[PDB]
Design a protein around this ligand. Sequence first.
Ligand code: NAG
Ligand code: NAG
Lengths: 40, 22
Amino acid sequence: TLEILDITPCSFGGVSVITPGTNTSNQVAVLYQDVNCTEV
Amino acid sequence: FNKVTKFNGLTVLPPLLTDEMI
Ligand SMILES: *[C@@H]1O[C@H](CO)[C@@H](O)[C@H](O)[C@H]1NC(C)=O
Ligand SMILES: *[C@@H]1O[C@H](CO)[C@@H](O)[C@H](O)[C@H]1NC(C)=O
């Protein structure tokens, strides 16, 4: 069926890990750079 | 801002300060 399909990269973006210094916590936020929060 | 004007691992990171900050 003739019709116009785009394409697009998958997602990528690097994972970044926020942390307050391990001086303080073992808790870390995570930042998935430039994605939409689904594919997590 | 009218004058002056995502593929292979190449990214573009967001500038830490958005224009409405600047
Ligand atoms: C980090 O923890 C050390 C002790 O391990 C303490 O001497 C120091 O004041 C702490 N740093 C801050 C910014 O509170
Ligand atoms: C994220 O995905 C949702 C659902 O697919 C969509 O409504 C929203 O516009 C998307 N936002 C971005 C920034 O991709």
